[PDB]
Design a protein around this ligand. Sequence first.
Ligand code: NA
Length: 417
Amino acid sequence: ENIQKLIARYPLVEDLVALKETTWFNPGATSLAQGLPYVGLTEQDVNAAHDRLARFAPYLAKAFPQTMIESDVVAIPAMQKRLEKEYGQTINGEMLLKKDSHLAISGSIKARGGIYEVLTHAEKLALEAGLLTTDDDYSVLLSPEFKQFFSQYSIAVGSAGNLGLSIGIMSACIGFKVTVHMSADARAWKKAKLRSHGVTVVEYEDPNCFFIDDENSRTLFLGYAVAGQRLKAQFAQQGRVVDASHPLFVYLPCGVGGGPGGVAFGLKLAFGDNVHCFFAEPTHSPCMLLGVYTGLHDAISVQDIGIDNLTAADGLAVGRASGFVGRAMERLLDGLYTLDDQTMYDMLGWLAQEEGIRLEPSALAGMAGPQRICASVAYQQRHGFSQTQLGNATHLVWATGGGMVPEDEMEQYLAKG
Ligand code: NA
């Protein structure tokens, strides 16, 4: 029992070990200009990513008719009032739902990171082999010659969820030999989804092979960051203002960190210091909260302090942070908070009731954020927020999965609240 030593210098570590619903507002959070140099990336890197996906748009158009891999944004005012009732706290401003749960390919946030990793790797090779240029129409990549080119290479991932689902599906559509290693206890539908695209799912109980790696890959991060500029266009189309007078609070589910980090960077680049991002994690897997708060990042894990890392949020069940995401983005995060499985399960049902939207438990992490921001007068005083500014604010909950989850599984999720 050497975890008691850390609990001395870091008071909040007591609540995390006790599985207490914690809400930590970052005192060392700052403007874009001051946060930027730590990120390791720049706007141009995102501009490249935007124009990468612009080049693959003709390819993806034909490949998956369901397609730009982008989700709608919708106001969820009935859900707002329901949260106000159940938990008490008033929610000032409009609440919006980002439905990355309904993205093409993998019905999840990974559709941004996963696909982009695959496409960028596939592009790189094609350019290096002298079979393609950046001025070519990327529909060429569907040809039998290019399928044969890609079959020469291979991709591999260890994931029982949306990472292996996204990489798996996209890698196969390109032409790669794809292999997703998985536990046999994983749900059969995901194995079936993968194998219908020609993926080799290996079940348990090399210079040619590219491994994904969510802990370090900047490519994934930059792929997520493409969401920022797209959201700005949606907001412009809907006559929605993001300003000092109209602040934008964003609530992002967090697993290892890549997803919400990349999105938060891209949003920061898009909307400046009037965007205010937050990470949401399960009480049983608070790795990014634990890593940022202590400053130990990837050095410390949730298992070390005695937390089991077991939770209904399968996508968020990550015991150790990415590390670089913590050091890179911490300054651009206004706060981090936890919520227990029952809170996710209950909100998941109320969202279905009030809005007719069905998500997986992990997606409901951001939903708790709004009332926790509105409750804290410490946070509002710390960031110089007036009461009128709060009233004209936009609270954007970021849903990260649900669209492809079959009925049987969704019926399982709904029977808990
Ligand atoms: Na986590």
